Design a protein around this ligand. Sequence first.
Ligand SMILES: [Mg+2]
Ligand SMILES: [Mg+2]
Ligand SMILES: [Mg+2]
Ligand SMILES: [Mg+2]
Ligand SMILES: [Mg+2]
Ligand SMILES: [Mg+2]
Ligand SMILES: [Mg+2]
Ligand SMILES: [Mg+2]
Ligand SMILES: [Mg+2]
Ligand SMILES: [Mg+2]
Ligand SMILES: [Mg+2]
Lengths: 169, 159, 204, 292
Amino acid sequence: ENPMRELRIRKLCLNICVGESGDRLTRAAKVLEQLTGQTPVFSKARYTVRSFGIRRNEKIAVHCTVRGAKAEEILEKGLKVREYELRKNNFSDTGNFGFGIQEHIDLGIKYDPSIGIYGLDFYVVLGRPGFSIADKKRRTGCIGAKHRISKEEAMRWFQQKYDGIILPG
Amino acid sequence: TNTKGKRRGTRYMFSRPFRKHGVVPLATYMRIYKKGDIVDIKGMGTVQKGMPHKCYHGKTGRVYNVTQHAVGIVVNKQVKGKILAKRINVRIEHIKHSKSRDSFLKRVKENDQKKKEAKEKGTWVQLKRQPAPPREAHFVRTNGKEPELLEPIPYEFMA
Amino acid sequence: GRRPARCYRYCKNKPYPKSRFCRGVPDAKIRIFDLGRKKAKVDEFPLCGHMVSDEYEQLSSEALEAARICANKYMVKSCGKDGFHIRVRLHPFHVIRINKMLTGMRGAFGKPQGTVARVHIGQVIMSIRTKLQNKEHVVEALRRAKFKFPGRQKIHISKKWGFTKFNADEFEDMVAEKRLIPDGCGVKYIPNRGPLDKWRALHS
Amino acid sequence: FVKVVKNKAYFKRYQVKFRRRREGKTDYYARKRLVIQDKNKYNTPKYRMIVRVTNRDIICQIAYARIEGDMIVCAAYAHELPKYGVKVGLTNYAAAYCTGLLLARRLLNRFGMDKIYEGQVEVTGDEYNVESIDGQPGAFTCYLDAGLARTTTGNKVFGALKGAVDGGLSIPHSTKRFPGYDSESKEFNAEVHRKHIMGQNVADYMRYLMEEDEDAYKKQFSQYIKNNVTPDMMEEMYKKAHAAIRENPVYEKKPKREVKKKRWNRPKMSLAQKKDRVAQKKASFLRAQERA
RNA sequence: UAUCCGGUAAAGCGAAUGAUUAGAGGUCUUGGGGCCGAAACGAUCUCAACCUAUUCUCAAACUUUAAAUGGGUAAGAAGCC
RNA sequence: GAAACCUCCCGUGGAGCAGAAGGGCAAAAGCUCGCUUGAUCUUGAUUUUCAGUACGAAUACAGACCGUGAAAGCGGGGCCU
RNA sequence: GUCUACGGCCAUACCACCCUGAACGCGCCCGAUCUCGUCUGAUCUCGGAAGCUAAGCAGGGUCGGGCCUGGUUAGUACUUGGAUGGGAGACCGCCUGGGAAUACCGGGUGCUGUAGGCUU
Ligand SMILES: [Mg+2]
Ligand SMILES: [Mg+2]
Ligand SMILES: [Mg+2]
Ligand SMILES: [Mg+2]
Ligand SMILES: [Mg+2]
Ligand SMILES: [Mg+2]
Ligand SMILES: [Mg+2]
Ligand SMILES: [Mg+2]
Ligand SMILES: [Mg+2]
Ligand SMILES: [Mg+2]
Ligand SMILES: [Mg+2]
């Protein structure tokens, strides 16, 4: 009989790290645009790495955050591709979870020989009502303690909500 | 030979005390210095505009000018043989009221009270101060119990 | 090779530790500041025989080594290999300089010759713990080690249990209640203060 | 496991920030600039028209800063506007205007400058500012203290400012962030602003919802529908309120008494009790373990 | 007699910075070498660095503390009301 | 993959602020944007070296013309040396 | 009793976890037409008032850490002035005045200004 300790999805985060810049990256942006229904953002590199073939301030990856119903919908698709299996290690200690998908066409998008096959990275930030305190401007605060989402508490949400398994190992 | 640099040897002088860095609390800025107010300079690292020179740190002096956010202040500085009253412009943050004078003002106020009163009475009262005199004749009552004997203690080597 | 100890005896200079500034310091002769059965519990070695200085002088790193060896060698021959623990309690930190002469006194400021420890009057140099059986052998072990130092030092037997800070008359009583708790060579002192869950680990 | 970030040492070296900075209220960087005087002014005040928008409220205060703690010359709230006419939408721009007006009028009645400095009555919305009349006591002057409000075009803080200005306080302002200014052109309307002042932006949204879907309108404007406040009744309502404010701004409080004087709180536990508690826990721990 | 200033002596390092001994505890990390293991955070040691309480000893160019001696002002008619 | 990008949490500053080092700095003095030319024109006063002369460097004002900001303000080069 | 707004001094106010919060407030909260701003109404801005004290916030708790303040440490360390004092020196004792700091052990754990609520 809890009132508003209702574990919800705060945001879903998506990124395609191509590590190439120029055209490959712009091509991947289109895929994220098709999936989410919103322009994404290019993230540039922190610094040069000669092994990976990237340069400081060169555009490596493209990412985008989705919130609310659209986020819920795209999360569902991602889980359908994964077949509603996650692991113990997939949940973070902070009560969030994430998972990859090995190719975006499995969600529900058409391939193209140009616009190829970009795999991507679902990360789900769970939350609760009254989590905004942390990031609002004026009378900020920390979200108590018996309020923070444990790893276990997010696992049981996922087991309930999306009917998942959470396999061991 | 030493460097003539302005801030040479102010590693500890202009350095905010332990756990008192950060914002300068506002009372500092919002208290009024008139002309002729005795004021004790004390540099402060945070505010760097209008710092006084290291020689005048610790020195007290009187105010002779009051600009927007600074105060001209006559101080005495010694120079080998000769003392030079000289006038420096220090930004408020490096300055306090010297309480030195206030105890005197209190004493004048007490004398004026004690001069208005005790005039219609006739009994003239001690107005001047007087140094701590010899501590008077008095009895010490060793009430019942005798005094406690104190032997010096025998040596032993601890460490 | 190196100078006589004579010249670098008295504590003349300010302390000149090996640091950012003082570098290219050749390493100290003494290195192992303790030996014997150092893996021994408080209760199986209570004696605490110190060698205490009586001059404000400098002991060379070389001297401290020689003294240690001297004391350890005799301890082993006397009682046994694993019947004592010796703690040297002066590390050579102070660096000691050497203006060398193949120009004259122009620009003289030394290179680091070596290291040295400064000792105050009443400060401890070496210390040994063993059994109440073995008082005599400790005394002679330190006596022998005196001859490797300059100046004058007394050998003194403490009123403390082992190498602890706790008076040996009170030790056993403090242990049983649980003011004190064994902790390798040392002994952890538990006070009142700490949350009551710490208290509940003891008394159980 | 990891290195414990917060040791004894950490706390030992740690400096707390100021209380109001911790609490997340006072921007001390801005406060220094805002509030202190030029020393050659000496003991003359420096007033600020504080404006703070709460979730359900709008507070406007005028205050100078004394060393004991900044003193409030005069204050007006949004929850007073029920007296004057405004029933609902009290955190809204139009109410913010009223609050700021009310404040200005209240201040002016204290100094006897109610009759002088009538200010702007018709409510144009345009650039207005109060010239001090010669041979008469000068206009009151204060500065706008926004606080931690992101001052952007159309912030209710400036609504209160506008109200005060129209009330007759010489507060300096541009019109760059009155709602009506166009960022991609750089001119002011002052008809757009007028509408916002008289709740027409609310009224229109009230009309747009009723047209679209009844259920949403009913949800969004429940307390508007209760009390009977229609879209076409809106503009008039605010104009009446302004006139009521203008005619009498004075505050009379309520004569509060008949208090039981009881402790809702919990008093602090005495040393001896705490000293006892631990002894009981110790005893309890011993007696419990001497069984199993 | 009031009232400011100070960072030397001392002290401290279970307080920061830097140095530094030892055992207790810790698969935190992980390793490199082992021994018993096909191999296994399996068992057993080990030495690396890191950490949890403790412990030994230090600093002209470190310091939470912090003296003695010391430097300003002030102690009225150019002042009060 | 120890290192690419994203996310949550801890984080008194252990980073950064052109350079030596010291001080100073967290809804900044750091970073990222937006608009700019107070690094402009002009009297004196003062400080620092001091002989209490210069230079340099600085501090407080005052008069102009500007910038910026909703505004209080801040700005006549570089957080201070 | 206590809160809100703006505060002063800036830990006796900090941190950790635990409990309790009447009424008014403060909040979370529900929306995005307009204003405004985002990759994203998350923040920011705006329009609200269906829920709820879960969280923030307040009050209390912990043989809590920290901080504040006493003791102890100790008349110890150090130190002004003095001697044809000692000592081969290193250093030490005395006289004359001044006099600290850890460890260890206690107590305390925000005060309060202006303006406006509530407990009528
Ligand atoms: Mg020879
Ligand atoms: Mg020398
Ligand atoms: Mg601001
Ligand atoms: Mg010095
Ligand atoms: Mg020293
Ligand atoms: Mg000018
Ligand atoms: Mg700069
Ligand atoms: Mg929202
Ligand atoms: Mg709550
Ligand atoms: Mg609760
Ligand atoms: Mg405590």
